[PDB]
Amino acid sequence: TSSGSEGNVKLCSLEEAQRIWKQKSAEIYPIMDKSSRTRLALIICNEEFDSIPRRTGAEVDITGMTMLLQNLGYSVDVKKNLTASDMTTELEAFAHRPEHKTSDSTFLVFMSHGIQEGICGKKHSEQVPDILQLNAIFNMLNTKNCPSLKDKPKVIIIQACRGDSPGVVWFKD
Amino acid sequence: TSSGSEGNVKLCSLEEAQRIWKQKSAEIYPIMDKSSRTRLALIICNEEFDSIPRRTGAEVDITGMTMLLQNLGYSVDVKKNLTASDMTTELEAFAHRPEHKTSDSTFLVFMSHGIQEGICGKKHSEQVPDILQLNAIFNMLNTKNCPSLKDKPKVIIIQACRGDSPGVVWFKD
Amino acid sequence: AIKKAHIEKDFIAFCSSTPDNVSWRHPTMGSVFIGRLIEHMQEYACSCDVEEIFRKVRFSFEQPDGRAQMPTTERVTLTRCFYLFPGH
Amino acid sequence: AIKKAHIEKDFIAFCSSTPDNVSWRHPTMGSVFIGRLIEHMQEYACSCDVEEIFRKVRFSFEQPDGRAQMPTTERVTLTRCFYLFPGH
């Protein structure tokens, strides 16, 4: 049934969990007690832009990802239509959250227009670029800038173009 | 015994191989017949430089990697002390090799001094940089520039610094 | 006392396409990578670690159509398998 | 007839350290990443796919000493598991 907290996410049973812990010895990330853990996830999605086309269908992405991460046990913060500077500020605030200390992991989701250089902010134009680089995301969440997530999986998901190319070449059979 | 072609590499038995093919359905890269396949691997190692310190111990790396790749069934081409331009030419030649057509995979190994920007050539200095970028390696071996390795695993191994930092931060227990 | 820790560890990034290349988004159905990821996470979170799930997502894109893309795993410093253990 | 194929697919890169950071090489013993990789490939090629082996290599570096580094898997577009099947 999809009426529970895990929704449409298929459950790992007790037998499945123990098989996972038996197939691999000490090579799995530890999970904290479900009753006391405070998992956090962040979604930054840019739909309405100043100079570039509207990302129609982004609300579907927001809904799907928010519900999925909740299903997986994460409390989801959703932030919309931000400049690269706003994204940096938001990422810095996220790294400072007290909940990470009593969490075992985190998910960061970024969804926007994209170019070769990185992820576009709301004010982006070819003349005056507004770009958040992937390198900055890592830097802001590393052991130095986010000590609370030391030794804990940090999953970064990015929906965006990485250039203008179709990503294909022709071949004959 | 380590007297065979596989040397010190532990063998996959017939029972182990079939267990691998049973645990996972159609999610394993196919391997070509051992009798007819022509696997190629390339090692580029820079030890002697014009302006930067000698990479003592590189011969140990060359020996170890060459023997390992041979043990794994690859014919190994070893190239030493090249400029970034020479590395590009060598990578282009490697992508043009007729053996890839009758191969199932490839390994590329790069070992040199390194900076943030990439891999140092023999003539590298702070004043006049001589750098091969990781992006160029991928580009030269992709489906467009190396159609013979289409659908085949291409493993790139890089020994080099990626900057000046020690890669550590302090914490208290 | 003080101890050393790696500055960067336990990261995994998953991008919607390869460098230089476009990623696709349907106006009503949403982003294809996002939709595909959710489907795979719903199905495989119970049995597969995240690296395995992302690989399955990549495989689902293998046959290119008119709107082709190849999601890419980047900058991986996961030292262990990350299982979500949904329900736990 | 002509068909479309992904321009970039079936790649995996394995670097000796994280971005910005040093990698270590002993004057007589060689590069620590290289030596560690060979050891793991010799031991685990028979039973583990390359992505799994590289993860094991990363784990072996987890406890930082005076010469710390964290090898990183980069730009991964492997759509399947790559098993070496040593002996085959």
Coordinates of C-alpha atoms in Angstrom, one line a residue:
Chain A
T1 CA 0.0 0.0 0.0
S2 CA 1.1 3.6 -0.9
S3 CA -0.8 5.1 2.0
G4 CA 2.2 5.1 4.3
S5 CA 5.1 7.5 4.8
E6 CA 7.2 5.7 2.2
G7 CA 4.5 6.2 -0.5
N8 CA 5.4 4.5 -3.8
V9 CA 9.0 3.5 -2.6
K10 CA 9.2 -0.3 -2.3
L11 CA 10.1 -1.3 1.2
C12 CA 13.3 -3.1 2.3
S13 CA 12.1 -6.1 4.4
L14 CA 13.9 -7.4 7.5
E15 CA 15.2 -10.5 5.5
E16 CA 16.3 -8.2 2.7
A17 CA 18.2 -5.9 5.1
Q18 CA 20.0 -8.7 6.8
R19 CA 21.0 -10.2 3.4
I20 CA 22.5 -6.8 2.5
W21 CA 24.4 -6.8 5.8
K22 CA 25.6 -10.3 5.2
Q23 CA 26.7 -10.0 1.6
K24 CA 29.0 -7.1 2.6
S25 CA 30.9 -6.9 5.9
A26 CA 32.0 -3.4 7.1
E27 CA 31.5 -1.6 3.7
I28 CA 28.0 0.0 4.2
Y29 CA 27.3 3.5 5.5
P30 CA 25.6 3.2 9.0
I31 CA 22.0 4.4 9.3
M32 CA 20.8 6.2 12.5
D33 CA 17.8 5.1 14.6
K34 CA 14.5 6.0 12.8
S35 CA 12.9 7.3 16.0
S36 CA 15.6 9.9 16.7
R37 CA 17.3 10.8 13.4
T38 CA 16.8 14.2 11.7
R39 CA 17.5 13.8 8.0
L40 CA 17.6 16.9 5.9
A41 CA 17.4 17.4 2.1
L42 CA 17.5 20.6 0.0
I43 CA 15.9 21.2 -3.4
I44 CA 16.8 24.4 -5.4
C45 CA 14.7 24.7 -8.5
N46 CA 14.7 27.7 -10.9
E47 CA 11.7 28.0 -13.2
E48 CA 11.1 31.7 -13.7
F49 CA 14.0 33.6 -15.2
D50 CA 14.7 37.3 -16.2
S51 CA 16.3 36.7 -19.6
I52 CA 15.9 33.0 -20.4
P53 CA 12.8 30.9 -21.3
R54 CA 10.4 29.5 -18.6
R55 CA 11.2 26.0 -17.4
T56 CA 7.6 24.6 -17.9
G57 CA 7.2 21.2 -16.1
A58 CA 9.5 22.2 -13.3
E59 CA 6.6 21.9 -10.8
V60 CA 6.3 18.2 -11.7
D61 CA 10.0 17.8 -10.9
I62 CA 9.7 19.6 -7.6
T63 CA 6.6 17.5 -6.6
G64 CA 8.2 14.2 -7.6
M65 CA 11.6 14.8 -5.9
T66 CA 10.1 16.4 -2.7
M67 CA 7.8 13.4 -2.2
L68 CA 10.5 10.9 -3.0
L69 CA 13.0 12.4 -0.6
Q70 CA 10.2 12.5 2.1
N71 CA 9.4 8.9 1.3
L72 CA 13.1 8.1 1.9
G73 CA 12.9 9.8 5.4
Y74 CA 14.3 13.3 4.6
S75 CA 12.8 16.6 5.7
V76 CA 12.8 18.6 2.5
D77 CA 13.5 22.4 2.2
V78 CA 12.3 23.7 -1.2
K79 CA 13.8 27.0 -2.6
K80 CA 12.8 28.6 -5.9
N81 CA 14.0 31.1 -8.4
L82 CA 17.4 32.1 -6.9
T83 CA 20.5 33.9 -8.2
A84 CA 23.9 32.2 -8.0
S85 CA 24.6 34.4 -4.9
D86 CA 21.2 33.4 -3.3
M87 CA 22.0 29.7 -4.0
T88 CA 25.4 30.1 -2.3
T89 CA 23.8 31.8 0.7
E90 CA 21.2 29.0 0.9
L91 CA 23.8 26.3 0.6
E92 CA 25.8 28.0 3.4
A93 CA 22.7 28.1 5.6
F94 CA 22.0 24.4 4.9
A95 CA 25.5 23.4 5.9
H96 CA 25.0 25.2 9.2
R97 CA 21.7 23.4 10.1
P98 CA 21.8 21.7 13.6
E99 CA 19.9 18.7 12.2
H100 CA 22.9 17.3 10.3
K101 CA 24.6 16.4 13.6
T102 CA 21.8 13.9 14.3
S103 CA 21.5 12.8 10.7
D104 CA 23.3 10.0 8.7
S105 CA 23.2 11.5 5.2
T106 CA 21.9 14.3 2.9
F107 CA 20.5 14.9 -0.5
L108 CA 21.0 18.1 -2.5
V109 CA 18.9 18.6 -5.7
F110 CA 19.6 21.4 -8.2
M111 CA 17.3 22.0 -11.2
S112 CA 17.7 24.8 -13.6
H113 CA 18.9 26.0 -17.1
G114 CA 22.6 25.1 -17.5
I115 CA 25.6 25.9 -19.6
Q116 CA 29.1 24.5 -19.9
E117 CA 30.3 26.5 -16.9
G118 CA 27.6 25.4 -14.5
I119 CA 24.1 26.0 -13.2
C120 CA 22.1 29.2 -14.2
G121 CA 20.7 31.6 -11.6
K122 CA 17.5 33.6 -12.2
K123 CA 19.3 36.7 -13.6
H124 CA 21.5 34.8 -16.1
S125 CA 22.1 36.2 -19.5
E126 CA 24.9 35.7 -22.1
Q127 CA 26.0 39.3 -21.5
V128 CA 26.0 39.1 -17.7
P129 CA 26.4 35.5 -16.5
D130 CA 24.8 34.3 -13.3
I131 CA 26.4 30.8 -12.7
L132 CA 26.8 28.5 -9.7
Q133 CA 29.7 26.1 -10.3
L134 CA 29.5 22.4 -9.2
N135 CA 32.9 22.9 -7.5
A136 CA 31.3 25.4 -5.1
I137 CA 28.6 23.0 -4.1
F138 CA 31.2 20.4 -3.1
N139 CA 33.3 23.0 -1.3
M140 CA 30.4 24.3 0.8
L141 CA 29.4 20.8 1.9
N142 CA 32.9 19.3 2.6
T143 CA 34.4 18.4 6.0
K144 CA 35.8 21.9 6.4
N145 CA 32.7 23.9 5.7
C146 CA 30.2 21.3 6.9
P147 CA 31.8 19.3 9.7
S148 CA 28.4 17.9 10.8
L149 CA 28.3 15.8 7.6
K150 CA 31.8 14.3 8.1
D151 CA 31.7 10.6 7.2
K152 CA 28.1 10.8 5.9
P153 CA 27.0 10.3 2.3
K154 CA 26.2 13.6 0.5
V155 CA 24.3 13.0 -2.7
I156 CA 24.1 15.8 -5.2
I157 CA 21.6 15.6 -8.1
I158 CA 21.8 18.1 -10.9
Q159 CA 19.2 18.5 -13.7
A160 CA 20.6 21.0 -16.3
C161 CA 22.2 21.2 -19.7
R162 CA 26.0 21.1 -19.7
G163 CA 26.3 22.8 -23.1
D164 CA 24.5 23.2 -26.5
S165 CA 25.4 19.8 -28.1
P166 CA 22.9 17.1 -28.8
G167 CA 25.3 14.5 -27.3
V168 CA 25.1 12.2 -30.3
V169 CA 27.2 10.9 -33.3
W170 CA 26.1 8.8 -36.3
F171 CA 27.2 5.3 -37.2
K172 CA 26.2 2.8 -39.9
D173 CA 25.1 -0.8 -39.1
Chain B
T1 CA 50.9 -20.4 -8.8
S2 CA 52.2 -17.1 -10.1
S3 CA 54.1 -18.7 -13.0
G4 CA 51.2 -18.2 -15.5
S5 CA 50.2 -15.3 -17.7
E6 CA 47.9 -13.9 -14.9
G7 CA 50.8 -13.7 -12.5
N8 CA 49.8 -12.5 -9.0
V9 CA 46.2 -11.7 -10.1
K10 CA 43.8 -14.1 -8.4
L11 CA 41.8 -16.2 -10.9
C12 CA 38.1 -16.1 -11.4
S13 CA 37.0 -19.8 -11.4
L14 CA 34.2 -21.3 -13.6
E15 CA 31.8 -21.4 -10.5
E16 CA 32.7 -17.8 -9.6
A17 CA 32.1 -16.6 -13.2
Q18 CA 28.7 -18.3 -13.4
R19 CA 27.7 -16.9 -10.0
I20 CA 28.6 -13.4 -11.3
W21 CA 26.4 -14.0 -14.5
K22 CA 23.5 -15.3 -12.3
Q23 CA 23.5 -12.5 -9.6
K24 CA 23.1 -9.9 -12.4
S25 CA 21.1 -10.5 -15.6
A26 CA 22.0 -8.3 -18.6
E27 CA 24.0 -5.7 -16.7
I28 CA 27.6 -6.9 -17.4
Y29 CA 29.9 -5.8 -20.2
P30 CA 30.5 -8.7 -22.6
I31 CA 34.0 -10.1 -22.9
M32 CA 35.4 -11.4 -26.2
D33 CA 36.8 -14.9 -26.8
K34 CA 40.3 -15.2 -25.1
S35 CA 41.7 -17.0 -28.2
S36 CA 40.9 -14.2 -30.7
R37 CA 40.7 -10.9 -28.8
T38 CA 43.3 -8.2 -29.1
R39 CA 43.1 -6.1 -25.9
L40 CA 45.2 -2.9 -25.8
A41 CA 46.4 -0.7 -22.9
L42 CA 48.4 2.5 -22.8
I43 CA 50.7 3.8 -20.1
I44 CA 52.1 7.4 -20.3
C45 CA 54.6 8.1 -17.5
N46 CA 56.7 11.2 -17.1
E47 CA 59.7 10.9 -14.8
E48 CA 62.4 13.2 -16.2
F49 CA 61.4 16.9 -16.6
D50 CA 63.1 20.0 -17.8
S51 CA 62.1 22.4 -15.0
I52 CA 60.5 20.3 -12.3
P53 CA 61.9 17.6 -9.9
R54 CA 62.6 14.0 -10.9
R55 CA 59.8 11.6 -10.1
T56 CA 61.9 9.0 -8.4
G57 CA 60.1 5.6 -8.0
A58 CA 58.2 6.0 -11.3
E59 CA 59.9 2.9 -12.7
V60 CA 58.3 0.9 -9.9
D61 CA 54.9 2.3 -11.0
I62 CA 55.6 1.5 -14.6
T63 CA 56.7 -2.1 -13.8
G64 CA 53.7 -2.8 -11.5
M65 CA 51.1 -1.3 -13.9
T66 CA 52.5 -2.9 -17.0
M67 CA 52.6 -6.4 -15.4
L68 CA 49.1 -6.0 -13.9
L69 CA 47.5 -5.0 -17.2
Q70 CA 49.4 -7.8 -19.0
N71 CA 48.1 -10.2 -16.3
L72 CA 44.6 -8.9 -17.1
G73 CA 45.1 -9.8 -20.8
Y74 CA 46.1 -6.4 -22.2
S75 CA 49.0 -5.7 -24.6
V76 CA 50.7 -2.7 -23.0
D77 CA 52.3 0.2 -24.9
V78 CA 54.6 2.2 -22.6
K79 CA 55.5 5.8 -23.4
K80 CA 57.8 8.0 -21.4
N81 CA 58.7 11.7 -20.9
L82 CA 56.3 13.4 -23.2
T83 CA 55.1 17.0 -23.7
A84 CA 51.3 17.6 -23.6
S85 CA 51.4 17.8 -27.4
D86 CA 53.2 14.5 -27.6
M87 CA 50.6 12.9 -25.2
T88 CA 47.8 14.2 -27.5
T89 CA 49.6 12.7 -30.6
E90 CA 50.1 9.4 -28.8
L91 CA 46.5 9.3 -27.6
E92 CA 45.3 10.0 -31.1
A93 CA 47.5 7.2 -32.5
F94 CA 46.1 4.9 -29.7
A95 CA 42.5 5.6 -30.7
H96 CA 43.4 4.7 -34.3
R97 CA 44.8 1.3 -33.5
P98 CA 43.1 -1.6 -35.5
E99 CA 43.2 -3.9 -32.4
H100 CA 40.4 -2.0 -30.6
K101 CA 37.9 -3.4 -33.2
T102 CA 38.6 -6.9 -32.0
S103 CA 38.9 -5.8 -28.3
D104 CA 36.2 -5.6 -25.6
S105 CA 37.8 -2.8 -23.4
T106 CA 40.8 -0.6 -22.8
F107 CA 42.9 0.9 -20.0
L108 CA 44.7 4.3 -20.1
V109 CA 47.2 5.1 -17.4
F110 CA 48.7 8.5 -16.9
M111 CA 51.5 9.2 -14.3
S112 CA 53.2 12.5 -13.9
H113 CA 53.5 15.7 -11.9
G114 CA 50.1 17.5 -11.7
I115 CA 48.5 20.8 -11.0
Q116 CA 44.9 22.1 -10.6
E117 CA 44.5 22.4 -14.3
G118 CA 45.7 18.9 -15.2
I119 CA 48.6 16.6 -16.0
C120 CA 52.1 18.1 -16.6
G121 CA 54.2 17.4 -19.7
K122 CA 58.0 17.2 -19.7
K123 CA 58.6 20.9 -20.5
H124 CA 56.2 22.3 -17.8
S125 CA 57.1 25.4 -15.8
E126 CA 55.0 28.0 -13.9
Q127 CA 56.0 30.6 -16.6
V128 CA 55.3 28.4 -19.6
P129 CA 52.7 25.7 -18.7
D130 CA 52.7 22.3 -20.5
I131 CA 49.4 20.7 -19.4
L132 CA 47.2 17.9 -20.7
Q133 CA 43.6 18.3 -19.5
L134 CA 41.5 15.3 -18.4
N135 CA 38.7 16.6 -20.7
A136 CA 41.0 16.1 -23.7
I137 CA 41.6 12.4 -22.8
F138 CA 37.9 11.7 -22.7
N139 CA 37.3 13.6 -26.0
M140 CA 40.0 11.7 -27.8
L141 CA 38.6 8.3 -26.7
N142 CA 34.9 9.0 -27.1
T143 CA 32.5 7.5 -29.7
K144 CA 33.3 10.3 -32.3
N145 CA 37.1 10.2 -32.1
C146 CA 37.4 6.4 -31.3
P147 CA 34.4 4.6 -32.8
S148 CA 36.2 1.2 -32.4
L149 CA 35.7 1.5 -28.6
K150 CA 31.9 2.2 -28.9
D151 CA 30.0 0.4 -26.1
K152 CA 33.3 -0.8 -24.6
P153 CA 34.6 0.1 -21.1
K154 CA 37.4 2.7 -21.2
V155 CA 39.2 2.9 -17.8
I156 CA 41.3 6.0 -17.2
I157 CA 43.8 5.9 -14.3
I158 CA 45.6 9.1 -13.3
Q159 CA 48.4 9.4 -10.8
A160 CA 49.2 13.1 -10.2
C161 CA 48.6 15.9 -7.7
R162 CA 45.5 18.1 -8.4
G163 CA 46.8 21.1 -6.5
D164 CA 49.1 22.2 -3.6
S165 CA 46.8 21.4 -0.7
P166 CA 47.4 18.6 1.9
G167 CA 43.7 17.5 1.6
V168 CA 43.1 17.5 5.3
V169 CA 41.3 19.4 8.1
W170 CA 41.5 19.1 11.9
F171 CA 38.8 18.0 14.3
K172 CA 38.7 17.2 18.0
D173 CA 37.5 13.9 19.4
Chain C
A1 CA 43.3 16.0 21.1
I2 CA 43.1 17.0 17.4
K3 CA 43.0 14.5 14.5
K4 CA 43.2 14.8 10.7
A5 CA 40.2 14.1 8.5
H6 CA 40.0 14.2 4.7
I7 CA 38.7 17.5 3.5
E8 CA 36.5 15.9 0.8
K9 CA 35.0 12.5 1.3
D10 CA 31.6 10.6 1.0
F11 CA 30.3 12.6 -1.9
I12 CA 28.5 11.5 -5.0
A13 CA 27.1 13.7 -7.8
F14 CA 24.7 12.6 -10.5
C15 CA 24.3 14.9 -13.5
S16 CA 21.5 14.7 -16.1
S17 CA 23.9 14.6 -19.1
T18 CA 27.6 14.3 -20.2
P19 CA 29.8 17.4 -20.4
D20 CA 29.0 19.8 -23.4
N21 CA 25.6 18.1 -23.8
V22 CA 21.9 19.0 -23.4
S23 CA 19.4 17.5 -21.0
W24 CA 15.7 17.2 -21.8
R25 CA 12.6 18.4 -20.1
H26 CA 9.0 17.7 -21.1
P27 CA 6.6 20.7 -20.6
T28 CA 4.0 18.6 -18.8
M29 CA 5.8 15.4 -17.9
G30 CA 8.8 17.2 -16.4
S31 CA 12.6 16.5 -16.7
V32 CA 13.3 13.0 -18.2
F33 CA 16.3 12.5 -15.9
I34 CA 14.3 13.5 -12.8
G35 CA 11.4 11.2 -13.7
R36 CA 13.7 8.3 -14.5
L37 CA 15.6 8.8 -11.3
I38 CA 12.4 8.7 -9.2
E39 CA 11.2 5.6 -10.9
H40 CA 14.5 3.8 -10.3
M41 CA 14.7 5.0 -6.7
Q42 CA 11.2 3.8 -6.0
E43 CA 11.9 0.4 -7.5
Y44 CA 15.5 -0.3 -6.4
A45 CA 16.2 1.6 -3.1
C46 CA 15.1 -1.5 -1.2
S47 CA 17.7 -3.8 -2.9
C48 CA 20.5 -1.6 -4.4
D49 CA 23.0 1.0 -3.1
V50 CA 22.9 4.5 -4.7
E51 CA 25.9 3.9 -7.0
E52 CA 24.1 0.8 -8.4
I53 CA 20.8 2.7 -8.8
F54 CA 22.5 5.5 -10.7
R55 CA 24.1 2.9 -13.0
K56 CA 20.7 1.4 -13.7
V57 CA 19.4 4.9 -14.5
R58 CA 22.4 5.4 -17.0
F59 CA 21.5 2.0 -18.6
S60 CA 17.9 3.1 -19.1
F61 CA 19.2 5.9 -21.3
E62 CA 21.5 3.7 -23.4
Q63 CA 19.4 3.6 -26.6
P64 CA 19.4 7.1 -28.0
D65 CA 16.2 8.6 -29.6
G66 CA 15.4 12.1 -30.9
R67 CA 16.0 13.5 -27.5
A68 CA 19.2 11.7 -26.3
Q69 CA 21.2 12.2 -23.1
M70 CA 23.6 10.2 -20.9
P71 CA 23.5 10.9 -17.1
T72 CA 26.9 11.0 -15.5
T73 CA 28.2 10.2 -12.0
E74 CA 30.8 12.7 -10.9
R75 CA 33.4 13.3 -8.2
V76 CA 32.8 10.2 -6.2
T77 CA 34.4 9.7 -2.8
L78 CA 31.9 7.3 -1.3
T79 CA 34.1 4.8 0.7
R80 CA 31.2 2.5 1.5
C81 CA 27.9 1.4 -0.1
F82 CA 25.1 3.7 0.6
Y83 CA 21.8 1.7 1.1
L84 CA 18.7 3.8 1.9
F85 CA 17.0 0.9 3.7
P86 CA 13.5 2.2 2.9
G87 CA 11.1 1.5 5.8
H88 CA 14.0 1.6 8.2
Chain D
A1 CA 21.2 2.9 -42.6
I2 CA 22.6 5.4 -40.1
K3 CA 21.8 5.3 -36.3
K4 CA 22.5 7.6 -33.4
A5 CA 24.9 6.7 -30.6
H6 CA 25.9 8.6 -27.4
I7 CA 29.0 10.6 -28.0
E8 CA 30.3 9.8 -24.5
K9 CA 29.5 6.5 -22.8
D10 CA 31.2 3.6 -21.0
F11 CA 34.0 5.7 -19.4
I12 CA 35.4 5.6 -15.9
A13 CA 38.2 7.7 -14.5
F14 CA 40.1 7.1 -11.3
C15 CA 42.3 9.9 -9.9
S16 CA 44.9 9.6 -7.2
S17 CA 43.4 12.4 -5.1
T18 CA 40.5 14.9 -4.7
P19 CA 40.5 18.2 -6.6
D20 CA 43.0 20.9 -5.2
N21 CA 44.9 18.1 -3.3
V22 CA 48.2 16.4 -3.4
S23 CA 49.0 12.7 -4.2
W24 CA 52.0 10.9 -2.7
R25 CA 54.8 9.0 -4.2
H26 CA 57.6 7.1 -2.3
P27 CA 61.1 7.4 -3.9
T28 CA 61.7 3.6 -3.8
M29 CA 58.2 2.1 -3.2
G30 CA 56.5 4.1 -5.9
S31 CA 53.2 6.0 -5.9
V32 CA 50.9 5.0 -3.0
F33 CA 47.7 5.1 -5.2
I34 CA 49.3 3.0 -7.9
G35 CA 50.6 0.4 -5.4
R36 CA 47.3 0.3 -3.6
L37 CA 45.4 -0.1 -6.9
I38 CA 47.5 -3.0 -8.1
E39 CA 47.1 -4.8 -4.7
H40 CA 43.3 -4.4 -4.9
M41 CA 43.1 -5.4 -8.6
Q42 CA 45.2 -8.5 -7.9
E43 CA 42.9 -9.5 -4.9
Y44 CA 39.5 -8.4 -6.2
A45 CA 39.4 -8.6 -10.0
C46 CA 38.1 -12.2 -9.7
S47 CA 35.1 -11.3 -7.6
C48 CA 34.3 -7.6 -8.0
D49 CA 33.5 -5.2 -10.9
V50 CA 35.8 -2.2 -11.5
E51 CA 33.6 0.3 -9.7
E52 CA 33.5 -1.9 -6.6
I53 CA 37.3 -2.3 -6.7
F54 CA 37.9 1.4 -6.9
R55 CA 35.5 1.9 -4.0
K56 CA 37.6 -0.6 -2.0
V57 CA 40.7 1.4 -2.9
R58 CA 39.1 4.6 -1.6
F59 CA 38.1 2.8 1.6
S60 CA 41.8 1.8 2.2
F61 CA 42.7 5.5 2.3
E62 CA 40.0 6.4 4.7
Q63 CA 42.2 6.8 7.8
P64 CA 44.5 9.9 7.1
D65 CA 48.1 9.8 8.2
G66 CA 51.0 12.3 7.6
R67 CA 50.6 11.7 3.9
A68 CA 46.9 11.7 3.3
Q69 CA 45.0 11.5 0.0
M70 CA 41.5 10.4 -1.2
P71 CA 41.3 8.8 -4.7
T72 CA 38.3 9.9 -6.7
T73 CA 36.2 8.3 -9.4
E74 CA 35.3 10.8 -12.1
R75 CA 33.0 11.2 -15.1
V76 CA 31.4 7.8 -15.0
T77 CA 29.2 6.6 -17.9
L78 CA 29.5 2.9 -17.4
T79 CA 26.1 1.5 -18.1
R80 CA 27.0 -2.1 -17.0
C81 CA 29.2 -3.7 -14.5
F82 CA 32.8 -4.2 -15.8
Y83 CA 34.1 -7.6 -14.6
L84 CA 37.7 -8.5 -15.7
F85 CA 37.1 -12.2 -15.4
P86 CA 40.8 -12.9 -14.8
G87 CA 41.8 -16.3 -16.3
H88 CA 39.1 -15.9 -19.0

